[PDB]
Write a protein that binds this DNA or RNA. Structure first.
Lengths: 122, 120, 62, 56
RNA sequence: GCUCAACGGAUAAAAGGUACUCCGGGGAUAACAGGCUGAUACCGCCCAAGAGUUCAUAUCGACGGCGGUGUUUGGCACCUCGAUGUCGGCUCAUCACAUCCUGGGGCUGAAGUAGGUCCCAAGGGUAUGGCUGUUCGCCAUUUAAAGUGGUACGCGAGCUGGGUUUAGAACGUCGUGAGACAGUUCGGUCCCUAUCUGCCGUGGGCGCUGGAGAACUGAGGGGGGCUGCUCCUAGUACGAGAGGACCGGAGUGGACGCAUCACUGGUGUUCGGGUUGUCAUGCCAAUGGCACUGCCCGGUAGCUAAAUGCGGAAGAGAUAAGUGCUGAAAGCAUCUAAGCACGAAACUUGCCCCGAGAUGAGUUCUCCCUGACCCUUUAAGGGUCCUGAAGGAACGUUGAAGACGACGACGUUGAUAGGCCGGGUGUGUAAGCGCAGCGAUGCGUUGAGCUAACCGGUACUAAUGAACCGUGAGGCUUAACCU
RNA sequence: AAUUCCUUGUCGGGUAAGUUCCGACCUGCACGAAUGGCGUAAUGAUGGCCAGGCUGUCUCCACCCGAGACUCAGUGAAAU
RNA sequence: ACACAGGUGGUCAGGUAGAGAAUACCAAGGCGCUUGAGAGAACUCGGGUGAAGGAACUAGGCAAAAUGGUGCCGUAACUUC
RNA sequence: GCUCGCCGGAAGACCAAGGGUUCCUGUCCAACGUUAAUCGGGGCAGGGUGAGUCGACCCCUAAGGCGAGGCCGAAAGGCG
RNA sequence: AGGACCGAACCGACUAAUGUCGAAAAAUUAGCGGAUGACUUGUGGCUGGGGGUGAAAGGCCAAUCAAACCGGGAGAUAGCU
C-alpha cells in the first residue's frame, strides 16, 4: 500500500537518503503498490558524492512496508518503516550492490535474486 | 443497523442514561413496588437482577461494591439483609412486570414493576 | 478554439470562440484577438502566421 | 415547491382513506370481577389472570 | 433681411455618463438555449494526370464538381424582457457511431516482430497531477487504450464565487470635463419543508369468481460483456544479418461489481484499569460525580474496508464484413438468381436476480364446509335462532428483520427474551490483612478478583386457557361417458 | 510590475511537470521626481510562491454519542 | 407587534489549585429552559477516534488538527540600534 | 419529601431608568399559555407601599433654553 | 513611560459553518483585533431636509437615504399597462 507523495527511507546503496513517488506503475489505472511493486520515483535527498542526485525520475521497486504483508497461511509481517530499492528505469536493472534492512519472503520472484543475495535479514 | 445491539438508549444521552437506573433502582428497592414507563422497566430488570445476584452472596467488599453502585448505604442496609437472604433460593427472576394502562400526560405505556416476592 | 468568460450584467454566460492556428511541420501557433469574426479571425491569424513566419527569415538574412 | 394546481377533494380522500384508527377486537374479561380489560394488561382495578396481584 | 445643422422648419437662443440608479414598459428591439437555412466548418463521393525507380488506385489527389449532419461563427427576429436567472469544476450520468484499444477480416509500397488503410461494431473500459477560474492548452510519468460529439454549449427547486457583473479602492491611456475600456488588481448575503408526474424501495384493499395455507413452470425486465504479462506448444514456420508467431492449454495481478467478519486492522460514550484538578460520605483508605468518555491505553458480539472468495466465459441457431462449394442469366467464367456449410466482445439464449394484477388471472398437493323456516320481480334476494370450522389477524416476548407495515421463531405438547450456572473474552495481581521501612511505596495471598451483545443448559420471572373475522357444498350453457 | 492587449516575451533558480513566484536583459502599446521616484528595520484580523510538522481535505470513508427526521397522543401553520 | 437562544447603567462577588475577576469543581442563593413517550431508517447539524500515505483536495493549506506554561544555555539576515 | 444534574465575578441578591398593581390570599377553568393544568405574570372580590436621619422637592452653578432693557428682520421670529 | 505585547469584562465583527416561510426584519458556536487610549459607557442639552454631520461612504438622521418622515398642492401627468 504505497501511493504517490510517500516519503520513504532508502535502505540500499547508490547514494540516496530520501525519495518520493510520483506514479504507481504496473497497470491501467492501478492505484496501489504490492510488496515488491514497481514504483516510478524521483530523488529527494542524495549524498554529495553519490551516483544520482535530487530530483531525477527512475523506477524503483519497493521492499519494506509500514502496512506489511500477509503470509499465505495468514501471518502479517509488519515493518516499522518503508524501504525501496532503485531500478535502472530504461533497462529495469536493480543497481543495488549493498542493501541493509530486512526483506520479504514474497520477494522471491526471480527478478530479485541479486537482491536477496545481498539480504542480511529474512 | 442494530444487528445484535443489546441496548435501549431511550432517547436519553449517556450520563443521564446510566444515572436514570441509578436513581430508579434505589427507589425500586425503597418501596418494592413502583410504576413507570414500560420500556424503562424492560431495561432496569437487566440491572436489578444482577443487583440481587451480587446480594445473593454476601461480602463486606460486595457491600463496599454495592456502595460503589447506587451510592446509598440505607439501600444496602436494605439489601443483603432481607432480599438477598430471601432470594437465595431463587436463581434468576426477581421482579415481575405487569401492564397498568397509559399515562394521562401524553399516552405513555404504564406498567407496574414489583418483585416476585413483594414483601408478603 | 478556446473559450473564456467576459464582462456583463446579472445573467451573463456566453464565452467566445477564440482561435489558435499553427503550422504543424514547423510548430509555431497563432492566436490573435484583434478582430472578432468566424473566418476573419483566421484572416488575421494567417496574417500573423506569415508575418511571424517572415519575422523568422529576416534576421537569418542578416 | 407547491402544487401548480389545487389538489381535488377526491384524491384528498384517496390520500385520507388509509387512515382509520383501530378496533381493539381482542377483549379479555377478568376471571374474578368480570372486568373486560386489555389482553396482557391488568384490569382497571388491577386484577390479572384471576388474581388480585396488583396488591393495591 | 437675420432665418431654419434635423430644409412642413415644434422661436431664427441648445452637448455627454449612469455598471449609484429609479418608474411605465417591449421578445414591438439585442445575448445564452430552442426553431428554419446551410455561406463557413467537418465528413462521404465524381473526374484526373503528375511526384511516386517500373505502376493514378498506397496516399496528396490539385485546376473544378455533387450532396449529407446540425456540434463552430454567422444569417432571420419565430417564442420568453407582468425574469427561460450563472462559464468551469466536484458529483452523477447517458445515447447515437464519423472507433482510442478489442474480436472477425480485404489489401499493402505489411518479409517477419510490429504498423498503414477500409468495413461490421456499443459490449466493456474511456487516467493521476503542476500553473490560470479557465473547459482549452503546454508538459512529466504508466498501461492494452487515456475515443469524437449530443443532452438549456447534460447536471446550480444538489455545491462553491474562484472567474465574471453592483455598492469601496488602485494603475495606465483617450477627453477641457463627468466617465468609459482590444484592458488588471484585492474583497464581495448565492434562498426554497416537494402536490402531481418521474425514479428506487416498501405495504394495505380488492381480485384471483368454493374458501384457506404452501410449492413451481414461465413471458417479460435488469445486472454481468476490460484484459495485461509469463511458460508449454516452439526460440519450429518465416527472414537480408538482426529479430521472432496466430491458434489450443495452464498460472497470476490491476480496476469494477456482488457476497462474507473466519483470518489482518479501525470504532466500540453498555467491559476493566490508569491518571490531573476538584466536590461529597466527619478525615484517610475503598469509591462516585463533573471538566467534549476530562485526557487516555486496550477490548467481546457486531459494522465496514485496505482484509477473504467469485465473475469477465465455453457452447447451440442465424448472423455483419468476409471465405466458399457446384453452377446460371451468356454452351464457358463467376459465393448467385435455388440450396447448403463456416465466420464478431455483436443479437436469442446461456449465469443470476424480480417475476402469472402475463385478466390468456396458469399447474400440482393438502385441509375444511353436507340445519330448519318466512315474504318471494320465485331472484346469483334479505333475515332470526343454532354451529362458529382450515386459517388468518389482533395482542404479548423478540430477530444477525426492520422507518411505520411486512417476513421468521415462540405462546405451555413451552427455551422467544431477561436473569442465573459452568465456561469463554477482555482488563492484569481487587478489598482486607501481615512484613520491610523515616516515608511514599513495594512484596505475598493472586491467572485470583471484576466481567455487556458470545457457547451449551436452566420455566426462576414474563408470554392466561380464550376471544373477533371467516362458512353452512362451488352459478348458466355445451359435450363425450352412466343408474 | 497594482503599470505590457500582443505575451505564457527572453535566459537560469525553485520543480518529475511551473501563465503565478525570486533575480537579470530592455523590444517602457501607455513608469517617472511631490497625480512624488528608488530602498527601508519595526508593523499588518493584507495578496501570492515553497519547506518542516501535523492531521480524514483526498485515495475510500468506517464506526460511535446526542437534538431532529419515523410511529403514537395534544395544538396545528405557511409560500403557491 | 410574541411568555422571543439578542441587547441594557450602579453595588456585593467567598473556598481550593492558580500570577490573575482566566479556568475547573463547589458554598450562599436560585433553578431543570412548559410538549412528551418510544423507535434507533436515509440524511443535516453539533462532536470523538482512526489502520497506509500525508495536501496527492482545492480558486487558496479555507475549514480542521497540531503547536501552546515557568526556568537555564544560546539565538542569524537586517537595522533608524 | 427523597435521590441526580446545572449556573455559580452568574441563569444569583438589592437600587436607579422605565414600565404601571403585573406584588399577596381565597375561589374558579370557557377565553390567554404552541399539550392537559385544582398551575401562573389569566378572570373576580378583598388586602398590601407607614420615613425629620433613604431618594426627591428645597438653596447655589456650567453647556443649553426663555429672556423685561435693546438690536435686528416682510410678520412669525432670531440673538443677546 | 509605552496610540508596547499576551489576554477576561467592555467595544468591534476576520474566516467558515448554521439560519433564510429563521431563536433574530444580521444573531449563535469554536478560534480572533484593540484592551493606557484617536479607548468605552451612563445622564442632561445643542446643530436638521435640499440642510445637518462626516478619520470621506455620498455612509447615518428612530428597522423607512443620490436624498427620511407627515399633511396639502393634486383626483399631478402618463400618445404606457
Amino acid at each position: 500500500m504505497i501511493q504517490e507523495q510517500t516519503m520513504l527511507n532508502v535502505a540500499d546503496n547508490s547514494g540516496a537518503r530520501r525519495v518520493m513517488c510520483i506514479k504507481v506503475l504496473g497497470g491501467s489505472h492501478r492505484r496501489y503498490a504490492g510488496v515488491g511493486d514497481i514504483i516510478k520515483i524521483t530523488i529527494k535527498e542524495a549524498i554529495p558524492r553519490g551516483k544520482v542526485k535530487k530530483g531525477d525520475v527512475l523506477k524503483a521497486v519497493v521492499v519494506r512496508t509500514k502496512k506489511g504483508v500477509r503470509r499465505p497461511d495468514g501471518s502479517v509481517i509488519r515493518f516499522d518503516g518503508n524501504a525501496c530499492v532503485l531500478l535502472n528505469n530504461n533497462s529495469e536493472q536493480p543497481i543495488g550492490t549493498r542493501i541493509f534492512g530486512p526483506v520479504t519472503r514474497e520477494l522471491r520472484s526471480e527478478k530479485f535474486m541479486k537482491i536477496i543475495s545481498l539480504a542480511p535479514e529474512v | 443497523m442494530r444487528h445484535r445491539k443489546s441496548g435501549r438508549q431511550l432517547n436519553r444521552n449517556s450520563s443521564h442514561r446510566q444515572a436514570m437506573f441509578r436513581n430508579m433502582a434505589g427507589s425500586l428497592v425503597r418501596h418494592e413496588i413502583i410504576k413507570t414507563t414500560l420500556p424503562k422497566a424492560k431495561e432496569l430488570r437487566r440491572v436489578v437482577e444482577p443487583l440481587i445476584t451480587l446480594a445473593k452472596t454476601d461480602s463486606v467488599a460486595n457491600r463496599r461494591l454495592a456502595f460503589a453502585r447506587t451510592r446509598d448505604n440505607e439501600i444496602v442496609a436494605k439489601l443483603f439483609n432481607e432480599l438477598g437472604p430471601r432470594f437465595a433460593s431463587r436463581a434468576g427472576g426477581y421482579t415481575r412486570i405487569l401492564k397498568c394502562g397509559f399515562r394521562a400526560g401524553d399516552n405513555a405505556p404504564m406498567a407496574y414493576i414489583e418483585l416476585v416476592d413483594r414483601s408478603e | 478554439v478556446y473559450r473564456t468568460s467576459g464582462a456583463g450584467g446579472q445573467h451573463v454566460n456566453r464565452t467566445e470562440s477564440a482561435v489558435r492556428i499553427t503550422h504543424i511541420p514547423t510548430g509555431i501557433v497563432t492566436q490573435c484577438q484583434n478582430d472578432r469574426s468566424q473566418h476573419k479571425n483566421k484572416d488575421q491569424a494567417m496574417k500573423q502566421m506569415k508575418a511571424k513566419l517572415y519575422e523568422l527569415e529576416m534576421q537569418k538574412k542578416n | 415547491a407547491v402544487q401548480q394546481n389545487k389538489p381535488t377533494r377526491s384524491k384528498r380522500g384517496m390520500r385520507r382513506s388509509h387512515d382509520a384508527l383501530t378496533a381493539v377486537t381482542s377483549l379479555s374479561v377478568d376471571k374474578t370481577s368480570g372486568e373486560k380489560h386489555l389482553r396482557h394488561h391488568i384490569t382497571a382495578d388491577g386484577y390479572y389472570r384471576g388474581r388480585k396481584v396488583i396488591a393495591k
